Design a protein around this ligand. Structure first.
Ligand SMILES: *C\C=C(C)/C=C/C=C(C)/C=C/C1=C(C)CCCC1(C)C
Ligand SMILES: CCCCCCCC/C=C\CCCCCCCC(=O)O
Ligand SMILES: CCCCCCCC/C=C\CCCCCCCC(=O)O
Ligand SMILES: CCCCCCCC/C=C\CCCCCCCC(=O)O
Ligand SMILES: CCCCCCCC/C=C\CCCCCCCC(=O)O
Ligand SMILES: CCCCCCCC/C=C\CCCCCCCC(=O)O
Ligand SMILES: [Cl-]
Ligand SMILES: [Cl-]
Length: 264
């Protein structure tokens, strides 16, 4: 039901997707190690944000490594190409974790914005349903990525609508709460928001890849877009949310944050 299943692969195409995914694993688990070690410099009121990037990290990676292994399971080298065998490879599983990981990353953004209590809980609920809305219509969407390109695109459209709207909540909260942020980070947070615009927009582009390059090289460009967008949405975004928590913690008098910064 997916375009991955339609083609045999050259050894070059096949090895590259394997390395892409394996390199993702590497990055997401090496990153996991970092937020873990620097969590001790983050003040108690921001420490969940870093914590939540650990979880993002172990969620991508788990999925990624599983995709890696389903890739070599599904295909074998037959008559000079890599050909599909008894098992299948799908990206089905990548949408499912975005059900899981997006809240996390929206939540860690909200936490560094200094949202508290009912505005935290309420913002958090709308966004989580908003992004849930986006993922699930696109998830259904890609189900017809071979059979019925009409649905992918209408399902796409329904899902972008969800994207636009979630994007709007987010940025309202970012520029609404900009002034609350300590230690320079009101400038930083606006770079965060644009980074999100960039990375998030790469996934729907992977989404459309079938309608505009339905062939084995589009399969490869899809996984390329995913790695870029995952690295950008998950890890680097993580990196940047952490910088913001450390700096606010030290601006707010958390001495191990003042010592970690001053130590560099
Ligand atoms: C790992 C983190 C993130 C933020 C993944 C985000 C995924 C999207 C922004 C996907 C958006 C899509 C849309 C808008 C339309 C077609 C189907 C998608 C869900 C891929
Ligand atoms: C900021 C995100 C960076 C993500 C790193 C991704 C690594 C990709 C780097 C170089 C791509 C060029 C490699 C050539 C593709 C070979 C094509 C083929 O085998 O058919
Ligand atoms: C194992 C798969 C192939 C990759 C090999 C792993 C080599 C790791 C290279 C960097 C991974 C990205 C994590 C970036 C470091 C975070 C610490 C920091 O700079 O703040
Ligand atoms: C590989 C990982 C082994 C240990 C991982 C991180 C050590 C964390 C130390 C700490 O508590 O700050
Ligand atoms: C909650 C989602 C609300 C409505 C989404 C409906 C539009 C997509 C329907 C596609 C079905 C079809 O092509 O038959
Ligand atoms: C070209 C190379 C691309 C580099 C990719 C981005 C690297 C990671 C960001 C470094 C994390 C620090 C965020 C900035 C904090 C600050 O304002 O000084
Ligand atoms: Cl605190
Ligand atoms: Cl994820």
């Amino acid at each position: 039901k997916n375009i991955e299943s339609l083609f045999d692969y050259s050894a070059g195409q096949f090895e590259f997707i394997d390395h892409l995914l394996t390199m993702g694993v590497g990055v997401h688990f090496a990153a996991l190690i970092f937020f873990l070690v620097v969590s001790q410099f983050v003040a108690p009121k921001y420490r969940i944000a870093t914590a939540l990037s650990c979880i993002v990290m172990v969620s991508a990676g788990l999925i990624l490594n599983s995709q890696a292994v389903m890739w070599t399971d599904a295909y074998a080298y037959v008559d000079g190409s890599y050909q599909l065998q008894d098992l299948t490879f799908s990206n089905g599983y990548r949408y499912v974790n975005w059900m899981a990981t997006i809240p996390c990353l929206l939540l860690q953004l909200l936490i560094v914005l200094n949202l508290k209590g009912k505005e935290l809980f309420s913002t958090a609920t709308w966004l989580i349903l908003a992004a849930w809305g986006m993922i699930i219509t696109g998830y259904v969407g890609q189900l017809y990525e071979v059979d019925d390109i009409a649905q992918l695109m209408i399902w796409g459209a329904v899902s972008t609508a969800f994207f636009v709207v979630m994007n709007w909540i987010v940025g309202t909260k970012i520029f609404k709460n900009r002034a609350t942020m300590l230690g320079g980070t009101d400038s930083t947070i606006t770079k965060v928001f644009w980074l999100m615009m960039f990375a998030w927009t790469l996934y729907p582009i992977a989404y459309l890849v079938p309608a505009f390059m339905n062939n084995a090289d589009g399969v490869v460009l899809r996984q390329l877009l995913f790695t870029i967008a995952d690295i950008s949405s998950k890890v680097i975004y993580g990196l940047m949310i952490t910088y913001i928590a450390i700096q606010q913690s030290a601006a707010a008098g958390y001495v191990p944050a003042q010592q970690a910064l001053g130590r560099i």
